[PDB]
Amino acid sequence: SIAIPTNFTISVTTEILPVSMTKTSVDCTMYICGDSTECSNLLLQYGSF
Amino acid sequence: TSNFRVQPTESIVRFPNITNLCPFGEVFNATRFASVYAWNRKRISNCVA
Numbered sequence: 001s002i003a004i005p006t007n008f009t010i011s012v013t014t015e016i017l018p019v020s021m022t023k024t025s026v027d028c029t030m031y032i033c034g035d036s037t038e039c040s041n042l043l044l045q046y047g048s049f
Numbered sequence: 050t051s052n053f054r055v056q057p058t059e060s061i062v063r064f065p066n067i068t069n070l071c072p073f074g075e076v077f078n079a080t081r082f083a084s085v086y087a088w089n090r091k092r093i094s095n096c097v098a
Contacts, residue, residue, distance in 0.1 A: 027052045035054055 071096035 028049075033039030071093055083089045 030052055030054070 067095060067097065069096040071098045073098065 028043060029035070029040050033043055073093070076091065076093070
């Protein structure tokens with residue numbers, strides 16, 4: 001027993017692929033210390049984090 | 050390279066236009082002082098300290 005199609009169909013299926021995220025950057029002293037020169041001295045004591 | 054932050058131009062200070070002298074002179078130097086358990090809590094307001 002064999003089943004053979006007679007009339008075909010053509011579909012269009014969408015596909016979703018991310019390619020990139022939102023490019024982001026950050027600065028410690030503005031984030032961590034906030035332009036304060038008292039914290040700017042403390043932060044550098046923690047090495048090159 | 051780094052973060053550019055515009056240096057502040059000058060310093061601006063604003064305080065309420067009140068110049069009443071606080072009664073601390075007689076509060077600390079009061080003649081009679083209460084006991085430890087019956088401490089007389091005093092509220093000071095509307096005066097420059």
